[PDB]
């Protein structure tokens, strides 16, 4: 299957209360593997998955150096953007940056990403060609010009097409037992009367990896999208995911309904019926 590596960075100002808090997290696919938290005691990049603990001190020292530099850049950004938007010094603001790369089933580069948000809205993003920038408004155009002059896109392209892909492969190899696995969903259905003339049928998918899944209900083969309660796919806390989909069935009509499950770990999609 395809794979991805992503790093996510959040900095939040707290005027009067010291430096902004900075949190970095790194993922391969849907598995977190590192963190940094400016408020924590270690002041180091830390492992958050067992497979990465085998990395040595060279690795951890280097990642710590880099993430500290990221922390400083983003602290400065909070001040610069406060100025660019003519905002008061009293309020808390947020900056977010995400970057990373995708590869296909052949582990070859598919695409690269680098984007930046201020107070939860797009600020500046590298376009798919990794050569040009989208800027959200007039403030952002200024940053675009600074980053054009400093040839940032060329640097990021080299990272995204090169380093990121090489390391994603390295991590996939080194963490093979966790990262190269598929856990097919374990499925079941529940049935609960809501009255004497209706019942809820809930179709469950549990303990699956990766998180990507499709769960749908049909009635006599017709999709029931508008009448299905579908929850967001949610972490179990153990590296697997969960999801369910429910429909309210008039009593006596259970046989009309089918639940359809599609997941990488299922060679053929499943069709479930209450019967």
């Amino acid at each position: 299957g395809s794979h991805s590596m992503r790093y996510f960075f959040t900095s939040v100002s707290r005027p009067g209360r010291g430096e902004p808090r900075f949190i970095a997290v790194g993922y391969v696919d849907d598995t977190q593997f590192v963190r940094f938290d400016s408020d924590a005691a270690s002041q180091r990049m830390e492992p958050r998955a067992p497979w990465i603990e085998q990395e040595g001190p060279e690795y951890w020292d280097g990642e710590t150096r880099k993430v500290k530099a990221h922390s400083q850049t983003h602290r400065v950004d909070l001040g610069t953007l406060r100025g660019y938007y003519n905002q008061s010094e009293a309020g808390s603001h947020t900056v977010q940056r995400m970057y990373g790369c995708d590869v296909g089933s052949d582990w070859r580069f598919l695409r690269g990403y680098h984007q930046y948000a201020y107070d939860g809205k797009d600020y500046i993003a590298l376009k798919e060609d990794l050569r040009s920038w989208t800027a959200a408004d007039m403030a952002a155009q200024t940053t675009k010009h600074k980053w054009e002059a400093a040839h940032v896109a060329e640097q990021l392209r080299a990272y995204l097409e090169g380093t990121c892909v090489e390391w994603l492969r390295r991590y996939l190899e080194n963490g093979k037992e966790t990262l190269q696995r598929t856990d097919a969903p374990k499925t079941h259905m529940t049935h609960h009367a809501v009255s004497d003339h209706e019942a809820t049928l809930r179709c469950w998918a549990l303990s699956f990896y990766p998180a990507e899944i499709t769960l749908t209900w049909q009635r006599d083969g017709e999709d029931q999208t508008q009448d299905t309660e579908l929850v967001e796919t949610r972490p179990a806390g153990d590296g697997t995911f969960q999801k369910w989909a429910a429909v309210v069935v008039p009593s006596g009509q259970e046989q009309r309904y089918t639940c359809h499950v599609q997941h990488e770990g299922l060679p053929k999609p499943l069709t479930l019926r209450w019967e």
Binding site: K66, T80, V152, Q155, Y159, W167
Partner: peptide
Amino acid sequence: XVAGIGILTX
């Protein structure tokens, strides 16, 4: 796999 280049102030 921390980018070491391309991460500049706004």
